[PDB]
Amino acid sequence: DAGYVSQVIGPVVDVRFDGELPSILSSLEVEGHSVRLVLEVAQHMGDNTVRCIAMDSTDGLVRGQKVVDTGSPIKVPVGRGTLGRIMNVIGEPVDEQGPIDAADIWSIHREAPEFTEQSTEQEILVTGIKVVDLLAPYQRGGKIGLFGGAGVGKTVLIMELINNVAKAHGGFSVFAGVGERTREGNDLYREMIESGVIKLGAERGNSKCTLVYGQMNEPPGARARVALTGLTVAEYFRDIEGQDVLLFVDNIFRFTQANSEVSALLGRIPSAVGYQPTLATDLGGLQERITTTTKGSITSVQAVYVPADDLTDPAPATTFAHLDATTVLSRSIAELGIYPAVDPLDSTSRMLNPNVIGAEHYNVARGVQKVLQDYKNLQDIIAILGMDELSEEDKLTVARARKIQRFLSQPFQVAEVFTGTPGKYVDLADTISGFQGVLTGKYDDLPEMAFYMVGDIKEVKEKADKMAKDIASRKEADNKKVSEELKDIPSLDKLVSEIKEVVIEEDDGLEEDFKAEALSSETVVLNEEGKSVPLPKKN
Amino acid sequence: ADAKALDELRKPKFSSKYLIQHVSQKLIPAVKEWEKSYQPPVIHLGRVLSVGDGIARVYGLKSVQAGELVCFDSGVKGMALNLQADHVGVVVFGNDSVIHQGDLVYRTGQIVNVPIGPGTLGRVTDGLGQPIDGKGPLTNVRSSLVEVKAPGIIARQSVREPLFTGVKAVDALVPIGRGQRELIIGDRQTGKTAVAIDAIIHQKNCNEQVPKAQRVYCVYVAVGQKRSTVAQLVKLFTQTGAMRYTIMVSATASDAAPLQFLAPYSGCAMAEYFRDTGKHGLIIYDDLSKQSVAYRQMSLLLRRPPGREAFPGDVFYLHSRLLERAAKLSKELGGGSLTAFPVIETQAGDVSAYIATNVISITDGQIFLETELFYKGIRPALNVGLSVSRVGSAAQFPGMKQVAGTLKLELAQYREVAAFAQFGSDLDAATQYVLERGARLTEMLKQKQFAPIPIERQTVAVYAATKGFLDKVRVQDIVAAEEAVISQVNPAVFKILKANGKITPALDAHLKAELRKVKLPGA
Ligand SMILES: Nc1ncnc2c1ncn2[C@@H]1O[C@H](COP(=O)(O)OP(=O)(O)OP(=O)(O)O)[C@@H](O)[C@H]1O
Ligand SMILES: Nc1ncnc2c1ncn2[C@@H]1O[C@H](COP(=O)(O)OP(=O)(O)O)[C@@H](O)[C@H]1O
Ligand SMILES: [Mg+2]
Ligand SMILES: [Mg+2]
């Protein structure tokens, strides 16, 4: 009826069944474990043995421990009952608010939608970010990849995409945290209580986002399947509810990385750089499920971590074919202080087409990429010469491209807690006309760094007002300033006297609650009967 | 050869009995003739099949758990890592020269655990909790597992308390938080441990100043280091008094590979006592690049298939499940914290190494230490263009946040013109003025070793450089100029700046008044 544990090597368990082996991708429960241990069948080993990957840690597993078959893959709750909840890889609530009251629990394993049920319409999803909406515009119902290394701003960019798009969307969103920090999974949860996307208690059903989290502390079996758990919630809102879904997947790279951590233990010889041999079909099996069908729509935004800023690594290079839009974040843009650190050339979208976005949006986008590529080819000779002999045709294409690099930067609403300046939402028609003036030459009247960290073209034009007031300051240095004491400044001895007395109890708080148990100097083992005995005095 | 007719062979089909009737009365006198060489059969105990290179393959041990402490009959401990169908692969916690083929292995019943509590506070232990300082066994202590899972989303809160390190290159540019995991990465002998020792020394100066609950209890984990370097470091912590709040776990280079692999988890479980009881911890995993080499040795000798640079496939999970245990807990869990400083050594500055890029993606911030900035006099050799922090604001001093914002900004203008300093044109007084002030800001961040600075004395020294009061000082004697700024400025301006937290405009007047009353010796 049931099986037993045959072999535990790391996170990979071999389970032997005396007849009626479970199917591949089916879920198995381990009986008698400390926590709920769920094994997903990866392959059939051949001598009535299946090979599995565990969804929790395999510490405590005994050879011969009873393993029951659920007769089905990992089924998770889906529906309106999961909105405003944090889910596990196996559908457990990890937000400590009751059980998940969702009906019609769904398998996390299905095949991709067919070729006939594919939509071909291309409508622009306006973001509010003037490097996104100009140079590589996103598509509602399309697949967005935020590439970039560690620390270049993928999570801040995907947080600005949440409060701009997923708040004013109307439909439901799903965040799938795949192999990330639990700190920023808590920061996402807490600032969606405050913004109202997640509501708690009796108004739980008015929430608009389902959280599915598979963070870095989880074993590689849970990290490799949590991207299917959050996709199953997004596929229920697309198919059964018929809604438009926003699927945010933070670091889909961790899906491919977690399958690599079990690949040699599943008995596969390695491919190129160190990934599994099934790198393009495991990733392609996931990405083709995230599509816009004729029933509903899924607009997916995926952060893709590139290892060591290398876009030629095969795990981000496989993801490029699955994406309609592509936002490559660069470290060279970030080191100049320009945020969001989007490479204006390396970013590409399917919507950058004059038959889709119009020939006026398209030509100012290609005009910005023309002057920015010309600046990249001129910076070779500027460091050798100095940019003083270029006869003011190549000095104009430097001065305009340097204004454009600053004007591609933007203050973010989610980044004002570590920068200070409030974020700006720029409309689509307000950044096409703003980049037309810098391109045709309307705004050479303005200084170059006035374009830095602003919103509309009417904010750089008023930052040049403030920048030329404040350099017309610092002219008076004599008196009538704050440094004279007789105005409202107390003496430095009197200012010390308003310090409130703080106490020190000098005991460091260690003798108040600790259960100081006794630890045996002898070693204590188990005999053949299982009884606890001291170690026998014989070597 | 199919199993249908092979399990049909379980049914008897002998059709004759001229051996079954003969040898049944002949077997027991034949077994009893050679029973001197028969070892007794083993079911729930173990017996060593093969031992070598710190790995014992153990027959028997029917009911052992995975990751369980086992004990050989010679007294040395082990750990059942891969439980296979016919044997158990045991990593040996010590020297495997005392283990023979045929030794009895004893299951201890417990998953691997270390002593945690206030009794470890002040001791030097090995990678399993046994004290090596020669001060007797651990009293006032209790046992806890080394493989506790990290606190989840609902258990944490946002990182808001500072935990200053005393290094003003750190505390102004790359501000640490109270539950933040910050990597200290660099080449060999670039000052990696120095930045981490100055953090531990600075907590002893702050623990005698704060009311009993903002006190930070340090844990230093010395993986793979030599034993005389560790003894050189307890001598520094005892003569400073930092050893009152410091635990030291030291699985040195002579220890076994599963002891250096387990010492970051052994030290984190000792530091998790303070996080889980409302106190604040600070753990330094010095040479976390040496734990991955020790873990690679076990897995290659357990015959697990190698990967990138022959590392195991799950070597990301080796460090991700370790560092995610460093968190800031919620108010319902005590409000305690644990901040981690892992140390990774790179080879010739190659940040693109395999273990290096894993811990960069796990930890919040990075402290990059370059060997070419180290020899230009910049000590600590902090690469400002490469060292980032995830928290930014709301995790540093509010007084420092006013004066270090115009330092991170103005040092970016210094680096953007250093690639334009070979010509010497220095047009329109712009690329030359920031080259004079940006050179005066890198000399501000230079400081000594084993002498950390309080944050009120750091936010005054960088107050005096981003603002005026140092504009006509040569770039050769700014390091001595702050001794005028720290000592000759009236020291009650530090007490009111420590108690306020920010630079009030009533104090911005006195900080501009008393910085003109000092005579700097630069001439
Ligand atoms: N701020 C500093 N001022 C002066 N010397 C310093 C400073 N920081 C570190 N050093 C010196 O630099 C050398 C290397 O420092 P440290 O031991 O921290 O380096 P490391 O990267 O840990 O080296 P190793 O790879 O040998 O462990 C030592 O001689 C140390 O005293
Ligand atoms: N939009 C932004 N505006 C300002 N600073 C940013 C922005 N994005 C990132 N940063 C800075 O760079 C760091 C990298 O951001 P993060 O999203 O954590 O990057 P990644 O996920 O690629 O590691 C942040 O901690 C912050 O200091
Ligand atoms: Mg991230
Ligand atoms: Mg060192």
CSV table of C-alpha atoms in Angstrom, one decimal, chain A residues 134-135 345 352 359-375 397 400-401 404 435-436 438-440:
chain,number,residue,atom,x,y,z
A,134,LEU,CA,10.2,55.1,-23.8
A,135,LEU,CA,13.0,52.8,-24.8
A,345,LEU,CA,20.9,50.0,-25.4
A,352,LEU,CA,9.4,48.9,-29.9
A,359,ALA,CA,6.0,56.4,-35.5
A,360,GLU,CA,6.4,59.3,-33.1
A,361,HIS,CA,7.1,57.3,-30.0
A,362,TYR,CA,9.3,55.0,-32.1
A,363,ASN,CA,11.5,57.7,-33.7
A,364,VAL,CA,12.3,59.5,-30.4
A,365,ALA,CA,13.2,56.1,-28.9
A,366,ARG,CA,15.5,55.3,-31.8
A,367,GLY,CA,16.8,58.9,-31.6
A,368,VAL,CA,17.8,58.4,-28.0
A,369,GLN,CA,19.5,55.1,-28.8
A,370,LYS,CA,21.3,56.8,-31.7
A,371,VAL,CA,22.8,59.6,-29.6
A,372,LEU,CA,23.6,57.2,-26.7
A,373,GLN,CA,25.4,54.8,-29.0
A,374,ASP,CA,27.3,57.8,-30.5
A,375,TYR,CA,28.4,58.8,-27.1
A,397,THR,CA,26.0,64.9,-29.5
A,400,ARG,CA,22.8,66.0,-25.5
A,401,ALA,CA,23.5,62.4,-24.7
A,404,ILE,CA,19.7,62.1,-21.7
A,435,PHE,CA,12.8,63.4,-24.8
A,436,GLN,CA,11.9,65.1,-28.1
A,438,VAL,CA,16.4,67.1,-25.6
A,439,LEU,CA,16.8,65.3,-29.0
A,440,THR,CA,15.8,68.1,-31.3
